[PDB]
Design a protein around this ligand. Structure first.
Ligand SMILES: C[C@H]1O[C@H](O[C@H]2[C@H](O)[C@@H](O)[C@@H](O[C@H]3[C@H](O)[C@@H](O)[C@@H](O)O[C@@H]3CO)O[C@@H]2CO)[C@H](O)[C@@H](O)[C@@H]1N[C@H]1C=C(CO)[C@@H](O)[C@H](O)[C@H]1O
Ligand SMILES: [Ca+2]
Length: 827
């Protein structure tokens, strides 16, 4: 009777949405002070609810056993423990607890011990959330749409799995490269409901903010983000692809001509093979990766010698059949790459961890210790010829990427610099070859392409040829600038490649290059790869074409090698006698686009070079001059020298520290809490907001456009709690068969600060946008059938704007329940 509630007022409990949890404390009518006198209880005398209440006899017995063992009491009560025997034991436990409280006059040990005991109960930990599925964080929980117990978080939407393939709910029949629905809605952390028109409008607001970051933050139009990279296209409602499209038109006029489109060249991270034709049918407002060419490169050059495939795919298995690409404008624009901050980097780290560290590693949720231990092996393997974990023939992949036509190459930072360590600190063994190839791409690479696969000796070789500036076909003759341009690349993927004397590899170079002298650019040696940085530096190894413009090679030149850079043969030749400042690139015409497509893969777009300027595993910064953006501002001249046109920067948002995923362990910037906190409140991994502005300004100085990561899928770890009606679900959002979480209350962390940059800039510019661009809000979106709803600005992120959250390890009955009436405790 003494241990009841002081007053049934909300201030007497530790509530969440006026509900009670297992770890909740309360203020009783009387405190058993020191365990002797029943004293009236002040406001600072909160006590754990579990000290005097239990949601079943079993849990009470477990409480008795655990606290007896923890406090020093001998006797523990077994299976058949009578009802009242447990009550008297709990009274003894309370007496001992208050006695030990007065002996220390704090209540920290009690908090810790109660938390531990709660975490030892079945329905208060992961056990009630199991079975785990293929979610990157073990499981998912979908917030119910009509939660009677919590209208706090309802929604008329939460439309799931609306990928570009599955935008309308049924799989699109127009695209059949992918059997599946082309993605899944639940990827990581708290999943943003991008099917809510309010959230769509807020995403448009965030996009406008990012595109005008300079003006909005430092009153400087020189420091605006030029382009965007839409992250996790396959995990969000694809209506955003229209919204981001529309805007890029209405706000920047990319549809009008080609110069605007190229000045705001936006890309997608869409993995499903259906996404590139879906985007081409959308109107080519953005460009998608060439996944086919990526896989061809990976499986023909990078894989170990056992698992390496033939070389023919490198020609045919792509978006452009580069057998004879004699076209002024390619059918579909694309950007190609071999590695990225995630693709074929964190995968290799996972492989190493699962092999020689922690075989039980779950998804990509690494620990920093595991990361460093694995990186030791990674850095050693990168330097060996016999590679167990890392890529072979990286230089060959980049030699093909930077000479290919009809695609925009994206050079990854971690292929020129160490994936770990400080930014642009230590170079890789391939740095020289890649830099030489970029400079030679500026100087020589232009015109039509021709690729040939020749079976010679015991193996095969491939020859990629660029005819030169102006020469679109082999028959075209061009002019003097044409003759000093063009390039030949000869690659083999077998170290055992040995030709006989009777074997000759013929390489047609184009009608422009008849009887011309050619000098080696890159050459494979036993050392590694010799780069020739000028005609002089290689004048000892000149060779000539015949009267039909054919380079001819034999066993003297082509043989199999096996060194830490080449598992095969690499030979790149350029014509002799080009000006040291010769440039074969083109700028985009101002002529009005006519075909209804915004971005065109013309000769001007082929001249662009994307650069992914960050690694996931960048070492943290000690001093100012080690910040990433500072070093970028310092070394902008290097990027200008390399021919970089679009610099894809890391996501500059400030990182959370929960550690539930790799993104929040190395703090790349994809795990964030405030979407507008671009290094404002705190510095990000790469520098303060002012450092970012300086970097953007320095990049714009040399004419380089800047690309910002647009990440509308998920947000990590909000500070405020919230109780929601929810159901256990897989990554596809299907309810788990007979889980204990079925329309059940759950304590998610889905309430934003409310005094962050999200409160400041949230929906600020909406009023402006429908002023200047009304048609953006006229469009009836595809998945929803209704236009964006900018009426309400999103100042505080609530669970109503979210599809759900990864399982949190809190339990299915973590929200307390009166076992008599079988309803949750309310207030
Ligand atoms: C997490 C990261 O990748 C996610 O997508 C993965 C897919 O689930 C995989 O299936 C894989 O697709 C391959 C399949 O064979 C098939 O889909 C094919 O068509 O394409 C692939 C061929 O090899 O692709 C991914 C491999 O991990 C997710 O969809 C993607 O958006 C994610 N990328 C970034 C996202 C976030 C969000 O926080 C950031 O952490 C990083 O920027 C990246 O991780
Ligand atoms: Ca999603």
């Amino acid at each position: 009777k003494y241990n009841q509630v002081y007053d049934r007022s909300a201030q007497s409990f530790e509530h969440v949405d006026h509900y009670l949890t297992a770890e909740s404390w309360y203020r009783p009518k009387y405190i058993l002070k020191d365990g002797k006198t029943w004293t009236q209880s002040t406001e600072k005398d909160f006590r754990p609810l579990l000290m005097t209440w239990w949601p079943s006899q079993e849990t009470q017995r477990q409480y008795v056993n655990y606290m007896n063992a923890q406090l020093g009491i001998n006797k523990t009560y077994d299976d058949t423990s009578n009802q009242l025997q447990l009550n008297i034991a709990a009274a003894t436990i309370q007496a001992k607890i208050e006695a030990k409280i007065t002996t220390l006059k704090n209540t920290d040990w009690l908090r810790q011990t109660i938390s531990a005991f709660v975490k030892t109960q079945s329905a208060w930990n992961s056990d009630s959330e199991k079975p785990f599925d293929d979610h990157l964080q073990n499981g998912a929980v979908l917030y119910d749409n009509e939660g009677k117990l919590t209208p706090y978080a309802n929604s008329n939407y939460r439309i799931l799995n609306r990928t570009p393939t599955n935008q309308t709910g049924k799989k699109d029949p127009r695209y059949t490269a992918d059997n599946t629905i082309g993605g899944y809605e639940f990827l990581l952390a708290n999943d943003v409901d991008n099917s809510n028109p309010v959230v769509q409008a807020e995403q448009l607001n965030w996009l406008h903010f990012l595109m005008n970051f300079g003006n909005i933050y430092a009153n400087d139009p020189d420091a605006n983000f030029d382009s965007i990279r839409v992250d996790a296209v396959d995990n969000v409602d694809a209506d955003l692809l229209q919204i981001a499209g529309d805007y890029l038109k209405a706000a920047k006029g990319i549809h009008k001509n080609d110069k605007a489109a190229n000045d705001h060249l936006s890309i997608l991270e869409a993995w499903s093979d259906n996404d590139t034709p879906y985007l081409h049918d959308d109107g080519d407002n953005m460009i998608n990766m060439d996944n086919k060419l990526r896989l061809s490169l990976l499986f023909s050059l990078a894989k170990p010698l056992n698992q390496r495939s033939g070389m023919n795919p490198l020609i045919t298995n792509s978006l452009v059949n580069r057998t004879d690409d004699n076209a002024e404008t390619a059918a579909v624009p694309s950007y190609s790459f071999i590695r990225a901050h995630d693709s074929e980097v964190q995968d290799l780290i996972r492989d190493i961890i699962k092999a020689e560290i922690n075989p039980n590693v779950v998804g990509y949720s690494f620990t920093m210790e595991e990361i460093k231990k694995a990186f030791e092996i990674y850095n050693k393997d990168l330097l060996a010829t016999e590679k167990k974990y890392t890529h072979y023939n990286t230089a060959l992949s980049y030699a093909l990427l930077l000479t290919n036509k009809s695609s925009v190459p994206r050079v990854y930072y971690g292929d020129m610099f160490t994936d770990d360590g400080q930014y642009m600190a230590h170079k890789t063994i391939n740095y020289e070859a890649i830099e030489t190839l970029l400079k030679a791409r500026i100087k020589y690479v232009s015109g039509g392409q021709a690729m040939r696969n020749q079976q010679v000796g015991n193996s095969e070789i491939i020859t990629s040829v660029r005819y030169g500036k102006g020469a679109l076909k082999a028959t075209d003759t061009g002019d003097r600038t044409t003759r000093t341009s063009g390039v030949a690349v000869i690659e083999g993927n077998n170290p055992s490649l040995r030709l006989k004397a009777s074997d000759r590899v013929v390489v047609n170079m184009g009608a422009a290059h008849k009887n011309q002298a050619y000098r080696p650019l890159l050459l494979t040696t036993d050392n590694g790869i010799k780069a020739y940085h000028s005609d002089q530096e290689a004048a000892g190894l000149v060779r000539y074409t015949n009267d039909r413009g054919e380079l001819i090679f034999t066993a003297a030149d082509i043989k199999g090698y096996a060194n830490p850079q080449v598992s095969g043969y690499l030979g790149v030749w350029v014509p002799v006698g080009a000006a040291a400042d010769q440039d074969v690139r083109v700028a985009a015409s101002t002529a009005p686009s006519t075909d209804g497509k915004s971005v065109h893969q013309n000769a001007a777009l082929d001249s662009r070079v994307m650069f992914e300027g960050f690694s996931n595993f960048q070492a943290f910064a000690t001093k100012k001059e080690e910040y990433t953006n500072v070093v970028i501002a310092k070394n902008v001249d290097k990027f200008a020298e390399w021919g970089v046109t679009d610099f894809e920067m890391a996501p500059q948002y400030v990182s959370s520290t929960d550690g539930s995923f790799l993104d929040s362990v190395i703090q790349n910037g994809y795990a964030f809490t405030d979407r507008y906190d671009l290094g404002i409140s705190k510095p990000n991994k790469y520098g303060t907001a002012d450092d970012l502005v300086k970097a953007i300004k320095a990049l714009h100085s040399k004419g380089i456009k800047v690309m910002a990561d647009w990440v509308p899928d998920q947000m990590y770890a909000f500070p405020e709690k919230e109780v929601v009606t929810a159901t256990r679900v897989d990554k596809f959002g299907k309810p788990v068969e007979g889980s204990q979480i079925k329309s059940v209350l759950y304590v998610a962390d889905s309430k934003s600060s409310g005094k962050d940059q999200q409160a400041k800039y949230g929906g600020a510019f909406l009023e402006e946008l429908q002023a200047k661009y009304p048609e953006l809000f006229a469009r009836k979106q595809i998945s929803t059938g209704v236009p964006m709803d900018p009426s309400v600005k999103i100042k505080q992120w609530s669970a109503k704007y979210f599809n759900g959250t990864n399982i949190l390890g809190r339990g299915a009955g973590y929200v307390l329940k009166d076992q008599a009436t079988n309803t949750y405790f309310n207030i």
